Amino acid sequence: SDRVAQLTIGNSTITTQEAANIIVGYGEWPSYCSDSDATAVDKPTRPDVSVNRFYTLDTKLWEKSSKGWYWKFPDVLTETGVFGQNAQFHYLYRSGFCIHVQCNASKFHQGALLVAVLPEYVIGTVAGGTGTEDTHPPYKQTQPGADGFELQHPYVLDAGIPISQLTVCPHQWINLRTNNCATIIVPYINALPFDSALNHCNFGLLVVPISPLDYDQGATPVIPITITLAPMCSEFAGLRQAVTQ
Amino acid sequence: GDRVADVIESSIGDSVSRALTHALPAPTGQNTQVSSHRLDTGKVPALQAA
Known part of the structure; x- marks a missing residue:
């Protein structure tokens, strides 16, 4: 009843039977930019369902010797679906995100991944x-x-800062004996109301094994980690021709 | 006439077949309601047990 969950947004639905609740980063839900925070004067386009949906972008193989990986937002999506097109045709962009990292194994495997969101x-x-x-x-x-x-x-963290303190950021752990996924909801984070989806990455997603993967000879050795994410409350403005960078 | 308790509290003879379902009028196909995104734990419509 806290281990089971369904995430439905747009034309996409995710299910999990071994969840560990949901983290809402910094305690606040994504929202659209208010009329007093805004500064650009053109009426924005808010595509809704065609861009705020789940996109499954990548799968990595977790190995006994893996070091960990990171992805940048909104960079990971700038070339995918209707979201990407909007990010390319518009100068200004803003949105929140629902991140769902997946990784299942067996009751005989072990290991723990730290899944966190680090702004800037x-x-x-x-x-x-x-x-x-x-x-x-x-x-x-x-x-x-x-x-x-x-x-x-x-x-x-390839940046001169201790990963031991990364938990000060919105995060969850995927401890194989407990859960098979992490779900983090992130609101728009920036010092400006809107910004370029191409030039600026608002935050990075880190997936790092802290307790190494292990199992006995004979158990399935291929343990994938899949990244699925959904933009929330996407807004775009400053329309012109499409630009990739 | 009856007297022992098990006979009195008996259901032997009940001729009314209890029905668990009943018919409803349905002249047209069902409509579709507006729905929005749901990001909940606990609520899980997609999961079944065939």
């Missing part, structure tokens, strides 16, 4: 190892698209 997730480099080289991460690493990107040094 700026990536850093190892500065040439010695720290004397002022290198910078390449476009494919800051905005990895739907494939996401694997963490090089998970302990410092």
